[PDB]
Design a protein around this ligand. Sequence first.
Ligand SMILES: O=P(O)(O)CC[C@@H]1O[C@H](CP(=O)(O)O)[C@@H](O)[C@H](O)[C@H]1O
Ligand SMILES: O=P(O)(O)CC[C@H]1O[C@@H](CP(=O)(O)O)[C@H](O)[C@@H](O)[C@@H]1O
Ligand SMILES: [Mg+2]
Ligand SMILES: [Mg+2]
Lengths: 219, 219
Amino acid sequence: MFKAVLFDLDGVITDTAEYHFRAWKALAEEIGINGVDRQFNEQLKGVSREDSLQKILDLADKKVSAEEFKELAKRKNDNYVKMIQDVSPADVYPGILQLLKDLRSNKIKIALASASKNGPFLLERMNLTGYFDAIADPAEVAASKPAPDIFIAAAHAVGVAPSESIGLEDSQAGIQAIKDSGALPIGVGRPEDLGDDIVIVPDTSHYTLEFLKEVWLQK
Amino acid sequence: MFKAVLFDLDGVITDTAEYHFRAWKALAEEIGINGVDRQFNEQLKGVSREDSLQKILDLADKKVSAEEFKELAKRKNDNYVKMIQDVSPADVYPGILQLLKDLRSNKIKIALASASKNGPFLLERMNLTGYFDAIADPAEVAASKPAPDIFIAAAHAVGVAPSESIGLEDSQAGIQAIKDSGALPIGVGRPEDLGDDIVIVPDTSHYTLEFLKEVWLQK
Ligand SMILES: O=P(O)(O)CC[C@@H]1O[C@H](CP(=O)(O)O)[C@@H](O)[C@H](O)[C@H]1O
Ligand SMILES: O=P(O)(O)CC[C@H]1O[C@@H](CP(=O)(O)O)[C@H](O)[C@@H](O)[C@@H]1O
Ligand SMILES: [Mg+2]
Ligand SMILES: [Mg+2]
């Protein structure tokens, strides 16, 4: 019977994508480039700041100094951090608070397996700190998803092997990183995105202790 | 005020996409090709029967006689047609029937702008034919989505300019066809897929007569 659950943050617990998007939007407009819409920002999901910034510059063919490039990246980051001050318990995805409580009361370990450098602050803002047994530091992790490194650390830090764990992810890269860590992925989203070898729920309200017990029994 | 609503079928009124998938899968399973999952089926969405089969053959760099190519295409279409025999009013997306009635009783014209060769059949099976004043024949149009041809043809069929019409659609190419017809689009889905510049509802339950009216005003 699974001993831990390793939570993705963005797309499972909450939406950080929205704030990163407004942040890139504000910076693009601040400096006159158009065409940073939610469609275009599908290419700024996952990639680091350098890559994102290049793709926004590459839109108006703006040329910038190494000095200018560092500052713009920094004003995007200052933006992002200002905007996530708003985050409240109101921002938690359906079913998640009730899943965290059910897991805690069944003595199942709870770990965050997220690339957010803001994970600890976001879990405090949403008043979930008390549920989480460990937060994998993405700064202590050698490669991002689809490398399993983040899921292995999250497992190790609550004292379980990944093979004793379920991972919940929203992204195709995250599903891959769970599979390669040895954990059982349960997806949220569409099989068109995440694949049809793994069990997927349409939305997070379907992530129940009783559903996760059902899936563990049938692997 | 808008005089007509122009409806997509698949993704608005019901789901055909899933039976297509099953047919391409059961066909690929039979000829010994692997890798036809719902991820890959996303690349057949829009494509002709002919090119759909090619893309399944290209998965195994494989060729067959131009004669048996047509028997495969046929075997798959025969299979699709067997599977939609069970379509019923139970398969109509939420809000859609309530919307059709509200439109009718407000003397507002209702037309299918679908690429389905089986549109009329499906409408009978879902007992919607009575709500529909016209069905754009997709065989009688020069170019498929994202060309406007089908939304133009649908508007003309009920005696209005596209510019007097709202078009509801779930795909990026559909939205484009609606935009280039002169009609107002309202997407169902994700701005990440359909665009920032048009109004989008998360699902078909939000397509209310009252909501369409609010959008028609605010453009
Ligand atoms: O600037 P940061 O927030 O520190 C790191 C960037 C974001 O982190 C997310 C965390 P998760 O999905 O793994 O929870 C990823 O999904 C995004 O695609 C990624 O752009
Ligand atoms: O074989 P058929 O059913 O005759 C034609 C098949 C096409 O049907 C459309 C229905 P609609 O969305 O335009 O209503 C889908 O969007 C396409 O993805 C699909 O390839
Ligand atoms: Mg995520
Ligand atoms: Mg459609």
